Amino acid sequence: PAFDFKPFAPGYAEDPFPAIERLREATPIFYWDEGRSWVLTRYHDVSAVFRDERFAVSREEWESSAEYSSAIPELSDMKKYGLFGLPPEDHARVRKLVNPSFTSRAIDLLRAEIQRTVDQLLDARSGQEEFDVVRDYAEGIPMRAISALLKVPAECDEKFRRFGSATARALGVGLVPRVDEETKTLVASVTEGLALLHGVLDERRRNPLENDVLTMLLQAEADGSRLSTKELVALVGAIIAAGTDTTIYLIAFAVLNLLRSPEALELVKAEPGLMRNALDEVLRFDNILRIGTVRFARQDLEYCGASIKKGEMVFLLIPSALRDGTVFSRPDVFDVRRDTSASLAYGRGPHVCPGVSLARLEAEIAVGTIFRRFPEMKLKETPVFGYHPAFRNIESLNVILKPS
Ligand code: HEM
């Protein structure tokens, strides 16, 4: 019961539910075989850990703090001075410093730009031959959004996406046995990223702008002292890496689920206003993650029958927690008219996702346009699923915009 767990077993990133259900039903918390980290699977236990001050997100309360003083020494300052490397206090400070630039009203100004990119991708490979929603559509949206936000030209767009992808899989190199890319190039992508990032920051420092996120941050460091070089460059790099693949897999999953559910798609056609809720149910019904989010214990305790090593890692199994029958009625149903307030897709507590509104705005316009301009769009072949350490990645998704 509390036994097996094959989060990399082929056919899991396509349908991990039938398997992860059983762990859930039986054991409210097991101990992943090779993992040396427990694995919570139930909703109310998963949630409580989030807003729980007894747990931590960092390594200075791990089994080894000197485990990240090794392997990829280049992201050192990003793990120590980044959003997951700041002790609780320091983290509250940087968040309130940055949160306001992420409110839905603040990012709203990025609509025309995003639509703009959304049309170029569409109207540049339509009436061609075939269309891959990942490679020809999603992959090209998220970096353009963040670039517009930091006010970087569309030329740096390719460079930065390669940087965030690399970084996301690399920072997860201590939490999971395998990876999708190789340490050689991956390391080049990170170094080359920090490189550009340092040029971008020197120029903004030189030519500051009004009502601007980098400008603002550059002051709060060299002014009043609420932010520091380290915590800053870390901050920007985290943001890119944290909101690159995630948004890609939201957009992709959504199209897939609107193709896998004509009921659902016939409702978002009748009342577009559902699209915002639909996209939230997409993460609820079928989460982009593989295992979840990670918390390290600070001091021994026995959460639901389990004494844990002061420093021992714990995974919050987010795909299953969102399939919890006691919280969501008919939980194995993709229902666009459902109440999704309880979703934990974007987390809970002090580290709740600051990119939530941006992510919704991007997919709202990504998913809304393509369907509206290609309503008869149907799937082509079965969708392929890679082996990313952090989440169920979908490498391919081809469809026919208008059959015949
Ligand atoms: C579909 C899109 C996205 C999803 C599903 C997602 C998911 C999440 C989740 C679950 C967390 C919290 C993990 C924890 O428990 O500690 C998180 C945190 C975070 N997210 Fe997002 N995210 C998305 C988009 C974005 C975007 C677009 C950005 C930035 C532009 C972003 C930036 C961040 C950052 C910087 C954190 C660190 C929080 C902290 O400790 O300060 N995310 N995201």
168 is in an annotated binding site: yes
Three-state SS at 319: helix
Task: Say which residues have a Cβ less than 8 Å from residue 214's Cβ, sequence separation at least 6.
Answer: 150, 151, 200, 201, 204, 236
| Interatomic CA distance for residues 301 and 311, integer angstroms | 11
| Interatomic CA distance for residues 145 and 128, integer angstroms | 26
Pick the atom of ligand 1 nearest to 348's CA. Answer: 15
Query: Kind and range of the H or E element at 131?
Result: strand 131-132
292 is in an annotated binding site: yes
Closest C-alpha residue for ligand 1 atom 11: 353
User: Do the Cβ atoms of 291 and 39 come closer than 8 Å?
Assistant: yes
By DSSP bridging, strand 131-132 and strand 29-31 are: unpaired
With 0-12 / 13-18 / 19 or more C-beta atoms within 10 angstroms meaning exposed / middle / buried, residue 334 is middle
Phi then psi for residue 71, to 5 deg, are 50, 100
Resolution of the model in angstroms? 2.7
What are the sequence ranges of the domains in the chain?
1-404
Helix H segments across 207-299? 213-222, 229-242, 245-259, 262-270, 275-285
Assign a CATH topology to domain 1-404.
Answer: Cytochrome p450 (1.10.630)
| Interatomic CA distance for residues 359 and 149, integer angstroms | 13
Pick the atom of ligand 1 nearest to 345's CA. Answer: 10
Residue type, 144: R
What was the structure determination method? X-ray
355 lines ligand 1 (CB under 6 A): yes
Task: Say which residues have a Cβ less than 8 Å from residue 70's Cβ, sequence separation at least 6.
Answer: none
Cα separation values, 178 from 75, 130, 169, 172, Å = 19, 32, 10, 10
Task: Return the structure tokens found at 125.
Answer: 């490979």
In 3D, which of 63, 10, 6 has the Cα closest to residue 39?
A: 6
319 lines ligand 1 (CB under 6 A): no
